[PDB]
Amino acid sequence: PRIDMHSHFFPRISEQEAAKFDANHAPWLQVSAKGDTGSIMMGKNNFRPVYQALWDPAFRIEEMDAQGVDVQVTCATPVMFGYTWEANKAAQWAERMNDFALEFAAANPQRIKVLAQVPLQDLDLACKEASRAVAAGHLGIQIGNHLGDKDLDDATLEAFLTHCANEDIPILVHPWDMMGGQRMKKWMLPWLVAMPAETQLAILSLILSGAFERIPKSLKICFGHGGGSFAFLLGRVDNAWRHRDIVREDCPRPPSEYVDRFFVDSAVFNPGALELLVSVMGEDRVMLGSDYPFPLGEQKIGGLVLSSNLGESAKDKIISGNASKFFNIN
Amino acid sequence: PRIDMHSHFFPRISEQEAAKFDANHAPWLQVSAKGDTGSIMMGKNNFRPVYQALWDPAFRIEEMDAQGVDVQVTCATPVMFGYTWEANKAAQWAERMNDFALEFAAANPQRIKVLAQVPLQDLDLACKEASRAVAAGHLGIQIGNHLGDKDLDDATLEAFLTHCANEDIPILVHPWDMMGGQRMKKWMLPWLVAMPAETQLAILSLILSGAFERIPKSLKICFGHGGGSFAFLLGRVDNAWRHRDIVREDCPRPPSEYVDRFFVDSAVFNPGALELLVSVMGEDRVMLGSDYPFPLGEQKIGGLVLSSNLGESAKDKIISGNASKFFNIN
Ligand SMILES: [Co+2]
Ligand SMILES: [Co+2]
């Protein structure tokens, strides 16, 4: 069987319903008249043009069959996060978006599984919303990797991680609100450069701060897009931790020892990159993810893993094995 | 023989000489009374503590012997660049720093080779200063990877690159003035996260803009610290260029075809990282560099390459071969 655990949705959101939250920065979905194309829109600006598969759960199951993917986990498009908003307005919006998600997963909840979003800019509202959603049916939460200038070392974000680790709630960490200000203007560089760095920063933020020494080993946490550039740059981190007391102060073990404490999806779009990745993470902590349905997500879902020189057991774990232990799937 | 082509110096600069340029932003060297320790200082603030090898070319040759490195190329500590300054002041400062460099390399110019800095914020002054310096003895120029919000795609920086390509001047591109604003506060995250992303952005900036289709093939250009995270994330770039017309518009060939047009140093601090790197770049475009004398530079210079499963011939090219064609060292 095949489980793709990194994919996204966007719900049937009217201009009128989103304007009631923020007729300026609440995102909404405009579908064409035919009904197989459309755009995500902030106020009345065009944000991203999207395909029917993003919002239509029936059309999506049909593609899932063409693709040979049996169960697919899916979660909010990072533009739905609303972390910049006021906390009550975001807790309201999060509640609707996760309802929409169960509504979307209704089309076939043995094959479509959902992850919820939280108002992460408020620890209390984020914690209650995380537990409600798992009880309502979501298999876990998906969070942006940072919150303005708070990275995952921030005490509040660590508190949200521990809360989930204690309630045995799995977490997918997604790059979002990328760094870099005004420089990565064209050629989609924010996805090519800033996305991988954002992820690496999140992972390194937990490690070098000692967060893993303080968070329960029971936390199920996954970092998207191969964990950014983390695995390739890990040796540069180990060498700095050995040669610099300020790198070493909050981190008792050498940083590569902590790879036993988190997961990554397999989306790295290259056999060499994939082989190095499992070499660092181990075949048990790499899962099949595709970033479906966006252009940048590997058309042939699972094709990179299946054509690899990896073990037949390694393939089985990335394709299916680890994603069902991680998410508790039949 | 061994050639380490990535290393740095800092000259004997007094508080008062630096104050005549900017008693606020000009860096200077304070040596202890003993004289084997010291600090780089901006105005009156402590910037980096350094050790004798950074400024003492005699002490350095002695360590060069202990380390078994025959010739070492060296260049300015990126804090010396002064790209934020007024152009004439910076052209004045660059001229003194490159004189200092030849003064430093005087201690033994058959083992210490130098690269010059330029006032890159002024294309004319940068071009004259680049040619000046090569004629005075430098083997080429070292530049920060970006200039505020101008990346190597910027037409000024492209004009500086082709000026050098036409005068057959080699270029080492160094990450500097790292992105990330206020987030990577502690654990030296700017060196771990932002430095590799800066490099990757520079390389990708030339490729995806078509700069390599417009710059003469004769350009000898090298990117530091293994070219950042570029070689690992290259497949993500290829896949984006195939699936997105806006990634593809300015770039006629698929982006991984352009690895035949630049070099990288070998400083990636890991055998798997190193093996993937030469797999992407080819054994001919990877050169031994150590970032000596900073804490984060592999104290066993060349030790990573020599202990690798790479070919006897690959080792000879990285250790010695490529760095002497590139730099014209006999
Ligand atoms: Co995604
Ligand atoms: Co350096």
Question: Which DSSP string corresponds to A125-172?
Answer: HHHHHHHHHHHHT-S-EEEES-BTTB-TTSHHHHHHHHHHHHTT--EE
Contacts of B273 in chain A (CB under 8 A): 232-233, 235, 276
| DSSP-based three-state secondary structure for B222 | strand
The radius of gyration of chain B's CA atoms, rounded to the nearest angstrom, is 19
* Distance between first and last Cα of chain A: 11
Q: Which residues pair with A221 in a beta bridge?
A: A171
Residues in Cβ contact with B155 at an 8 Å cutoff, skipping those fewer than 6 apart = none
- b vs e for B212-245, b when ≥16 Cβ sit within 10 Å of the residue's Cβ? beebeeebbbbbbbbbbbbbbbbbbbbbbbeebe
C-beta of residue B17 within 8 angstroms of C-beta of residue B54: no
- Through-space distance between the first and last CA atoms of chain B, rounded to whole angstroms: 11
Residue A321, classed as helix, strand or coil, is helix
Contacts of B100 (CB under 8 A, 6+ apart): B11, B12, B13
CA-CA distance, B291 to B105, in Å (whole number)? 17
Q: Is A48 helix (H, G, I), strand (E, B) or coil?
A: strand
Beta strand A8-9 with A3-4 is unpaired
The answer to whether B115 and B94 are in contact (CB under 8 A) is: no
Cross-chain CB nearest to B191 (options A189, A240, A273): A240
**Mutate which of A157, A236, A278 to disrupt the B interface (most B C-beta within 10 Å)?**
A236
Contact present, B111 and B23 (Cβ < 8 Å): no
Omega within 30 of 0 (cis) for the link into B293: yes
Reduce the DSSP state of residue A302 to 3 states and report it.
coil
Distance of alpha carbon B260 from alpha carbon A219, whole angstroms: 44
Q: How far apart are CA A157 and CA A151, in angstroms?
A: 8
Write down how long chain A is.
Answer: 330
| Paired residues of B51 in beta bridges | B37
Please judge whether B187 and A204 are an interchain contact, meaning their C-beta atoms are less than 8 angstroms apart.
yes
Check: CB of residue A120 under 8 Å from CB of residue A157: yes
Residue type (1 letter), A330: N
Contact A232 B276 (CB under 8 A): yes
Contacts of B172 (CB under 8 A, 6+ apart): B5, B6, B75, B115, B140, B141, B142, B143, B222, B223, B224
Which residue among A200, A247, A269 places its CB closest to the CB of B193? A200
Dist. CA B244–CA A186, nearest whole Å: 12
Choosing among B183, B187, B188, B223, which should be mutated to test the A contact, i.e. which has the most A CBs within 10 A? B187
**B291 assigned binding-site residue:** yes
Residues A319 and A290: beta-carbon distance below 8 Å: no
Distances from the Cα of B80 to the Cα of A155, B22, B227, B273, angstroms = 37, 12, 22, 30
A2: amino acid identity, one letter: R
- The sign of the torsion formed by the CA atoms of A220, A328, A265, B182 equals negative
**Cβ-proximal residues to A16 (8 Å cutoff; 6+ apart), any chain:** none
Side-chain-facing half-sphere of A235: CA atoms under 13 Å = 22
Q: Could you give the C-alpha distances from B201 to B31, B66, B91, B176, B209, in angstroms and in order?
A: 36, 36, 27, 12, 12
For A187-190, which contacts have Cβ atoms below 8 Å and span 24 or more sequence positions?
A187/B204, A187/B208, A187/B209, A187/B246, A187/B247, A187/B250, A187/B251, A188/A296, A188/B240, A188/B244, A188/B246, A188/B247, A189/B201, A189/B204, A189/B205, A189/B208
What letter represents residue B148's amino acid? G
**Token reading at A118:** 């939280």
Q: What is the rounded distance in angstroms from the CA atom of residue A28 to the CA atom of residue A12? A: 8
Alpha helices in chain A (DSSP H): 15-22, 52-55, 57-67, 87-106, 123-136, 155-166, 189, 195-208, 211-214, 230-242, 245-248, 271-281, 303-306, 312-316, 322-327
- Supply B292's token pair: 């000596």
Which positions in chain A touch B240 (Cβ < 8 Å)? 188, 191-192, 295-296
For residues A186 and A203, give the distance between their C-alpha atoms in angstroms, rounded to a whole number: 27
| Residues A115, A117: Cα–Cα separation, whole Å | 7
* Residue B293 exposed, middle or buried by CB count within 10 Å (0-12, 13-18, 19+): buried
Q: Which helix (H) or strand (E) holds A308?
A: none
Q: What one-character-per-residue DSSP string does B163-208 give?
A: HHHHTT--EEEE--S-S-TTS--STTHIIIIIHHHHHHHHHHHHHH
- Three-state DSSP class for A4? strand
Least distant ligand from the CA of A145: 1
Q: What does the alpha-carbon distance between residue A192 and residue A296 come to, in Å, rounded to a whole number?
A: 10
Name the DSSP letter for residue B227: G
Distance of CA A86 to the CA centre of its chain: 23
Ligand nearest to the CA of B226: 2
The three-class DSSP label of residue A202 is helix
Give all domains of chain B, ordered by start, each with its CATH number: 1-330 (3.20.20.140)
Backbone angles phi and psi of A76, in degrees to 5: -65, 145
Chain discontinuities in chain B, listed by preceding residue (C to N exceeding 2.5 Å): none
Amino acid at B185: K
Q: How many CA atoms lie within 13 A of B120 on its CB side?
A: 30
What is the CA angle A176-A179-A181, rounded to 5? 125
Structural tokens at position A81: 């996060």
The dihedral through the CA atoms of A298, A300, A302, A306 has a sign that is negative
Question: What's phi and psi for B42, nearest 5 deg?
Answer: -105, 115
Contacts A247 to B, Cβ<8 Å = 187-188
Nearest one of A276, A266, A297, A295 to A2, comparing CA atoms: A266
Q: How many residues are listed for chain B in this entry?
A: 330
Give the phi and the psi of residue A172 in degrees, each rounded to 5: -105, 125
Task: Give the experimental resolution in Å.
Answer: 2.8
Are the beta carbons of B152 and B146 closer than 8 angstroms?
Answer: yes
Contacts of residue A245, defined as CB under 8 A and 6 or more positions apart, other chains included, come to none
The Cα A186–Cα A243 span in angstroms is 38
Beta-carbon contacts of residue B239 (< 8 Å; ≥ 6 apart): A269, A296, A298
- Which method, experimentally, gave rise to this model? X-ray
